[PDB]
């Protein structure tokens, strides 16, 4: 199950 | 540090006219939002902007469009305003933690500008009986006959705005409760010591800022144009 | 034995493309099991291993929606990075990510992983504690401060210790026999002539899986060896060779030991003249 | 930033037997950025029916691909792979030597 | 949408306030956020949490072990804390929030020395009901020409004093301060000056 990145971008 | 700007606080538009609401955020956050809030309801998202030219419809997009050409600004456009678009509009931004909300713009879209009236303001001096019974003195300010509900009442003591010892009604009263187009009334109290009131050099002013018709709005009615203006009333201390 | 799961994600921008190409590849025990590519006519996660084909449509739909969110995340991040490095127009740029979990033989979580690279170099990584970050340079320090303030590590730790581990367990159940399947190296020694009184001996290891292998030349069971890096055969198996420069007539005094998972014991090889 | 030139290996799937159907492989790895051009050549000419694996990368962030084609080797036919990448001034040609 | 809160909560200043929130269908990566919105100003972040109880300057957030409910705890509530409190789920990978109705929290002051009285203010070239305890409720007029506001609390921090008041006014002939608040249950000891 793929990770969705925490909404804060780089 | 984190501040979302929205001006004006209030706006009157005729139905069918274009409306442009502007929002600023100097933090250069990627994410910006437009919400509207109707009385007693939670905010409803109109549009979100993930970045420059990357806008997505929210829950209620109908009748609106947006523009995000720069990260620091986000525009909400009503191409042809409907009276049901009367609401308080809040812009917000985020960098990925919480959302930061602007102070809001109250927009009133009217069928015509005929019922627009500025307030009349009067100050009521303290009761001599209150002074002797309590050693305190309450002044009452009344702002009456205004429409729409676009007012900011403030008290000024010796040329300085005060907040302590003040209470302004959180909601205005309808001067004709059985009418949908009723003009409004608002009251506020300022309470000081009897000693402070008894000094004739002390000056008390109740100021009501009314947000009305634009300087560019047309007005042909047989009465003064109800423009954005300050209406005040004052009282001076009395040794008697 | 031990197990692992990883997702390897890449986004590539270029002047000729209006939106970056995004690729996400999932691995279980270092074998590709799922893939998403934005370049496909109908972008979606697809199974890359037959044992994954039994996952119902809700699974594929849920993963595909997540990939759409990742594409946006990478697109925005690429634009921020162009700013952080004050890069000039007309270039192609790459943002990569690796994430996943390592499980021990006793099924305990050994380590969670989360790493990012920009232009093929380390950018930022989540430390082994799953609480703090390592920033590779000055631009990554801007990111670190952002992620510390917004509490980003907590989101990544929760996925790595929770959902990552749970789903790896589920895949291991489905891909049971297939994932434990190893292929032993079929090995042989070739003879190659040289100048002076010398000859090259080449020990070939073929048809093995997984790629991990050791080839060791010894002189009486105890010069620097020459070799090729392990390479794919094209059928799911791997190949490798190791060579030694030996004097003429002394070929039998040299042995090649092959060490691999699939073997019951290490192989001992020698040049056998026909 | 600092780019990485491709490591190239050209070899057969199964050990080469003159007259036996096999697969010619060109394994390109350790390169960055991901854009790469790979051709398999027969007597200096580009083989038309060449397939390739989907793009992947290793733990060191570098990319890798396998290019392949069905082929029958002979003593006279020459095989090579030609690779071009941004890290190279000119395309690099590597000849297929069945002994490695 | 996924969160359920009571529409309103009553409290007295200095008390501990517990604001409940039900979110049975919460997903593993959804954060629990609390925002508050004072009268008509913009909402403002209060606190948030994922699994662990959170303490900050503003409030304490208690999240149940199963994560299916939470509580926002406001220790020693001040008048300033009166607002609508919104409990909202925020998915860790996205930027959206679905606001609900939230809980309207009222904070009534502790009236130290009540001195209920009805005064007539000096004419402009109004009746004031003041200093009653927060137990007193003021009703609207049973006359369309008489205007009566709801009670309002003012705070004189210069001397640590608070007072409740309501204003009545009319231009109508039969309006007097002695009858102004007749539709209200007013204290027995209410002072009416002669
Ligand atoms: Na209309």
Listing DSSP states for B104-160 in one string gives: -EEEEEES-STT-BPPEEEEEBPPHHHHHHHSEEEEEEEEEEEBSS-EEEEEEETTE
Instruction: Determine C/A contact with 3+ CB pairs under 8 A as the test.
Output: yes
Please state the length of chain E.
194
Interface test with C, best of A4, A8, A9, A10 (most C CBs within 10 A): A10
Say if CB E86 and CB E99 are below 8 A apart.
yes
A5–C73 CB contact, under 8 Å: yes
Range of the structural domain that residue C198 is part of: 186-269
Q: Give yes or no: residues C41 and C108 share one domain.
A: yes
C150–B97 CB contact, under 8 Å: yes
Sheet of B151-157: strands edge to edge? B160-162, B151-157, B203-210, B229-236
Helices C57-84, C138-150: axis angle to 10 degrees equals 130
Query: How crowded is the C-beta side of C88, counted as CA atoms within 13 Å?
Result: 2
CA B235 – ligand 1 centroid, Å: 43
Chain A residues with CB under 8 Å of E92 CB are 4, 6-7
Say if CB B78 and CB B105 are below 8 A apart.
no
Query: What CATH number should be reported for the domain holding residue C202?
Result: 2.60.40.10
Q: CA distances (Å), C162 to each of C5, C92, C159, E103, in order?
A: 13, 36, 5, 33
Alpha carbons E93 and A4: distance in angstroms, whole number: 6
B97–C76 CB contact, under 8 Å: no
The number of angstroms, rounded, from the C-alpha of B49 to the middle of its chain's C-alpha atoms is 27
Q: Give yes or no: residues C105 and C138 share one domain.
A: yes
Alpha carbons C63 and A3: distance in angstroms, whole number: 9
C69–E93 CB contact, under 8 Å: yes
Total beta-carbon pairs less than 8 A apart between chain A and chain B: 7
Any binding-site annotation on B163?
no
Q: Reduced to 3 states, what is the DSSP secondary structure of residue C135?
A: strand
- What is the distance between the terminal CA atoms of chain C, rounded to a whole angstrom? 41
Interface test with E, best of C62, C97, C154, C163 (most E CBs within 10 A): C154
Helix extents (H) in C14-162 = 57-84, 138-150, 152-161
Query: What is the largest distance, in Å, between two alpha-carbon atoms of chain C?
Result: 72
Q: Give yes or no: residues C26 and C51 share one domain.
A: yes
Alpha carbons B53 and E119: distance in angstroms, whole number: 61
Q: CA distances (Å), C145 to each of B95, B98, C20, D98, in order?
A: 12, 16, 26, 55
How many Å lie between the alpha carbon of B30 and the closest alpha carbon of chain A?
A: 9
Q: Give yes or no: residues C137 and C190 share one domain.
A: no
Tokens of D71: 């082929």
Task: Say which DSSP state C66 is in.
Answer: H
Task: Say which DSSP state E114 is in.
Answer: -
Chain A residues with CB under 8 Å of B97 CB are 8
Query: C 118-177 residues with CB below 8 A of E?
Result: 154-155, 158-159, 162-163
Q: Give yes or no: residues C144 and C192 share one domain.
A: no
Say if CB B141 and CB B190 are below 8 A apart.
yes
E50–C162 CB contact, under 8 Å: no
Tokens of E181: 């608040």
Q: Give yes or no: residues C154 and C219 share one domain.
A: no
CA B81 – ligand 1 centroid, Å: 7
Q: Give yes or no: residues C198 and C168 share one domain.
A: no
What residue has token string 């269908």? E25
Alpha carbons B33 and B22: distance in angstroms, whole number: 12
Any binding-site annotation on B29?
no
Instruction: Map E11-34 to HEC letters.
Output: EECCCCEEEEEECCCCCCCEEEEE
CA B16 – ligand 1 centroid, Å: 7
Who among D2, D4, D100 is closest to C241 (CB)? D100
Nearest CA in chain E to C152: E92
Alpha carbons D10 and D93: distance in angstroms, whole number: 10
Examine the fold and report which residue of C164, C180, C196 is the final residue of a domain before the chain moves on. Answer: C180
Q: CA distances (Å), E161 to each of B154, B190, E111, in order?
A: 21, 13, 9
CA B78 – ligand 1 centroid, Å: 12
Q: C186 has which bridge partners?
A: C206
Instruction: Determine B/C contact with 3+ CB pairs under 8 A as the test.
Output: yes
Helices C163-174, C152-161: axis angle to 10 degrees equals 30
In 3D space, the residue among E52, B95, E28, E60 whose CA is nearest the CA of residue C148 turns out to be: B95
Q: CA distances (Å), C203 to each of B222, C190, C245, C265, E37, in order?
A: 107, 6, 12, 17, 76
Chain E residues with CB under 8 Å of A5 CB are 93
CA B20 – ligand 1 centroid, Å: 17
Say if CB E60 and CB C164 are below 8 A apart.
no
Nearest CA in chain A to C96: A10
Q: What are phi and psi of B128, to 5 degrees?
A: -65, -30
Assess A7–E contact: CB distance below 8 Å, yes or no.
yes
Q: Give yes or no: residues C17 and C152 share one domain.
A: yes
How many Å lie between the alpha carbon of E59 and the closest alpha carbon of chain C?
A: 18
Tokens of B2: 């984190």
In 3D space, the residue among D85, D42, D50, D94 whose CA is nearest the CA of residue D64 turns out to be: D85
Q: Reduced to 3 states, what is the DSSP secondary structure of residue C174?
A: helix
Examine the fold and report which residue of C126, C161, C180 is the final residue of a domain before the chain moves on. Answer: C180
Please state the length of chain A.
10
Q: Give yes or no: residues C168 and C217 share one domain.
A: no
| Residue C226 resides in a domain | yes
**Resolution, Å (one decimal):** 1.9
Query: What CATH number should be reported for the domain holding residue C142?
Result: 3.30.500.10
In 3D space, the residue among C140, C112, C141 whose CA is nearest the CA of residue C127 turns out to be: C112
C147–A2 CB contact, under 8 Å: no
| Residues in contact with B65: Cβ distance below 8 Å, sequence separation at least 6, in sequence order | B47, B76, B77, B79
How many Å lie between the alpha carbon of A1 and the closest alpha carbon of chain E?
A: 13
In 3D space, the residue among D71, D39, D33, D34 whose CA is nearest the CA of residue D52 turns out to be: D39
In 3D space, the residue among B206, B92, B113 whose CA is nearest the CA of residue B151 turns out to be: B206
Q: Using DSSP bridges, classify how beta strands B10-14 and B105-110 pair: parallel, antiparallel or unpaired.
A: parallel
Tokens of E141: 């007029």
CA B59 – ligand 1 centroid, Å: 21
| Residue C274 resides in a domain | no
Tokens of C153: 């590590």
* Total structural domains within chain C: 2
The number of angstroms, rounded, from the C-alpha of C124 to the middle of its chain's C-alpha atoms is 19
Query: C 52-81 residues with CB below 8 A of B?
Result: 72, 75-76, 79-80
B97–C149 CB contact, under 8 Å: yes
E94–C158 CB contact, under 8 Å: no
Assess E92–A contact: CB distance below 8 Å, yes or no.
yes
Say if CB E168 and CB E146 are below 8 A apart.
yes
E95–A7 CB contact, under 8 Å: yes
Tokens of C12: 């590539």
Nearest CA in chain C to E30: C155
In 3D space, the residue among C225, C211, C216, C228 whose CA is nearest the CA of residue C258 turns out to be: C216
C72–B97 CB contact, under 8 Å: no
Cα three-residue angle E30-E36-E42, rounded to 5 degrees: 110
H helix or E strand, kind and range, residue B25: strand B19-25
C26–A2 CB contact, under 8 Å: yes
Query: E 134-173 residues with CB below 8 A of A?
Result: none
Torsion of CA C214, C219, C223, C226, to 10 degrees: -40
Nearest CA in chain A to E94: A7
| Residues in contact with E8: Cβ distance below 8 Å, sequence separation at least 6, in sequence order | E103, E104, E105, E106
Q: Where are the domains of chain D?
A: 1-100
Chain A: partners with 3+ C-beta pairs within 8 Å = B, C, E
Tokens of E92: 């860790």
B97–A6 CB contact, under 8 Å: no
| Burial grade of B56 (CB within 10 A; 0-12, 13-18, 19 or more) | middle
| Burial grade of C223 (CB within 10 A; 0-12, 13-18, 19 or more) | exposed
Q: Give yes or no: residues C117 and C253 share one domain.
A: no
Q: Give yes or no: residues C61 and C151 share one domain.
A: yes
Q: Give yes or no: residues C196 and C113 share one domain.
A: no
Any binding-site annotation on B133?
yes
H helix or E strand, kind and range, residue C169: helix C163-174
Alpha carbons B119 and B117: distance in angstroms, whole number: 7
Assess C61–E contact: CB distance below 8 Å, yes or no.
no
Tokens of C274: 């026909």
Q: CA distances (Å), C60 to each of C42, C52, C64, C67, D97, in order?
A: 13, 10, 6, 11, 44
């Amino acid at each position: 199950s793929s990770l969705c990145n925490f909404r804060a971008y780089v | 540090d984190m501040k979302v700007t929205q001006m004006p606080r209030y706006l009157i538009k005729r139905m069918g006219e274009n409306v442009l609401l502007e929002c600023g955020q100097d933090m250069s956050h990627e994410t910006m939002y437009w919400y509207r809030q109707d009385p007693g309801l939670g905010l409803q998202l109109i549009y979100i902007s993930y970045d420059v030219d990357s806008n997505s419809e929210g829950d209620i997009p109908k009748g609106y469009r947006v523009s995000r050409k720069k990260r620091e600004h986000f525009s909400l456009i009503l191409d042809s305003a409907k009276t049901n678009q009367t609401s308080v509009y809040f812009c917000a931004s985020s960098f990925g933690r919480e959302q930061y909300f602007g102070p809001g713009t109250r927009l009133t879209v009217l069928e015509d500008l005929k019922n627009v009236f500025p307030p009349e303001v009067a100050v009521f001096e303290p009761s001599e009986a209150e002074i002797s019974h309590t050693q305190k003195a309450t002044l009452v300010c009344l702002a009456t006959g205004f429409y729409p509900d676009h007012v900011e009442l403030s008290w000024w003591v010796n040329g300085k705005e005060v907040h302590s010892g003040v209470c302004t009604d959180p909601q205005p009263l309808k001067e004709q409760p059985a009418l949908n187009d009723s003009r409004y009334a608002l009251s506020s109290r300022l309470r000081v010591s009897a000693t402070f009131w008894q000094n004739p050099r002390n000056h008390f002013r109740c100021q009501v800022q009314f947000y009305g018709l634009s300087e560019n709005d047309e007005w042909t009615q047989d009465r003064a144009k109800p423009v954005t203006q300050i209406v005040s009333a004052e009282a001076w201390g009395r040794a008697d | 034995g031990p197990h692992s799961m990883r997702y390897f994600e890449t986004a590539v921008s270029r002047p000729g493309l209006e939106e970056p190409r995004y690729i996400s590849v999932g691995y279980v025990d270092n074998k590709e099991f799922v893939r998403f590519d934005s370049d496909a006519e109908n972008p979606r996660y697809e199974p890359r291993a037959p044992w994954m084909e039994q996952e119902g449509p809700e699974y594929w739909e849920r993963e595909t929606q997540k990939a759409k969110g990742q594409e946006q995340w990478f697109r925005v991040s690429l634009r921020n990075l162009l700013g952080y490095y004050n890069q000039s127009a007309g270039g192609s740029h790459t943002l990569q990510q690796m994430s996943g979990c390592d499980l021990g033989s006793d099924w305990r979580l050994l380590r969670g992983y989360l790493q990012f690279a920009y232009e093929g170099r380390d950018y930022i990584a989540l430390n082994e504690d799953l609480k703090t970050w390592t920033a590779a340079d000055m631009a990554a320090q801007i990111t670190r401060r952002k992620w510390e303030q917004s509490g980003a590590a907590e989101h990544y730790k929760a996925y790595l210790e929770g959902e990552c581990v749970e789903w790896l367990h589920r895949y291991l159940k489905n891909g049971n026999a297939t994932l434990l399947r190893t292929d032993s190296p079929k090995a042989h020694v070739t003879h190659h002539p040289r100048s002076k009184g010398e000859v090259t001996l080449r020990c070939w290891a073929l048809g093995f899986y997984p790629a991990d292998i050791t080839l060791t030349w010894q002189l009486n069971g105890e010069q620097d060896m020459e070799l090729v890096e392990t390479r794919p055969a094209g059928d799911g198996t791997f190949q490798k060779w190791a060579s030694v420069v030996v004097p003429l007539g002394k070929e039998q005094n040299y042995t090649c030991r092959v060490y691999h998972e699939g073997l019951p014991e290490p192989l001992t090889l020698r040049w056998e003249p026909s | 930033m600092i780019q990485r030139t491709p490591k190239i290996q050209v070899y057969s799937r199964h050990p080469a037997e003159n007259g036996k159907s096999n697969f010619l492989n060109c394994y390109v790895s350790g390169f960055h950025p991901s854009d790469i051009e790979v051709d398999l050549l027969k007597n200096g000419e580009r083989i038309e029916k060449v397939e390739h694996s989907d793009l992947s990368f290793s733990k060191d962030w570098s990319f890798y691909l396998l290019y392949y084609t069905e082929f029958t080797p002979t003593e006279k036919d020459e095989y090579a792979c030609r690779v071009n990448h941004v890290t190279l001034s000119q395309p690099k040609i590597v000849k297929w030597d069945r002994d490695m | 949408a996924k969160t359920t809160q009571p529409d309103s909560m009553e409290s007295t200043e200095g008390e501990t306030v517990h604001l409940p929130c039900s979110h049975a269908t919460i997903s593993g990566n959804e954060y629990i956020y609390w925002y508050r919105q004072v009268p008509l100003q913009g909402p403002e972040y209060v606190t948030h949490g994922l699994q662990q109880n959170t303490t900050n300057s503003m409030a304490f957030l208690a999240i149940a072990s199963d994560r299916k409910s939470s509580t926002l705890i406001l220790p020693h509530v001040s008048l300033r804390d009166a607002a609508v409190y919104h409990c909202i789920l925020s998915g860790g990978c996205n930027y959206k929030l679905t606001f609900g109705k939230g809980t309207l929290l009222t904070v009534t002051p502790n009236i130290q020395n009540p001195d209920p009285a009805v005064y007539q203010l000096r004419d402009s070239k109004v009746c004031l009901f003041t200093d009653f305890d927060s137990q007193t409720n003021v009703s609207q007029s049973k006359d369309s020409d008489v205007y009566i506001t709801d009670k309002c609390v003012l705070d004189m921090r210069s001397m640590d004093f608070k007072s409740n008041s309501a204003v009545a006014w009319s231009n109508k002939s039969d309006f007097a301060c002695a009858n102004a608040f007749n539709n209200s249950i007013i204290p027995e000891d209410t002072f009416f000056p002669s």
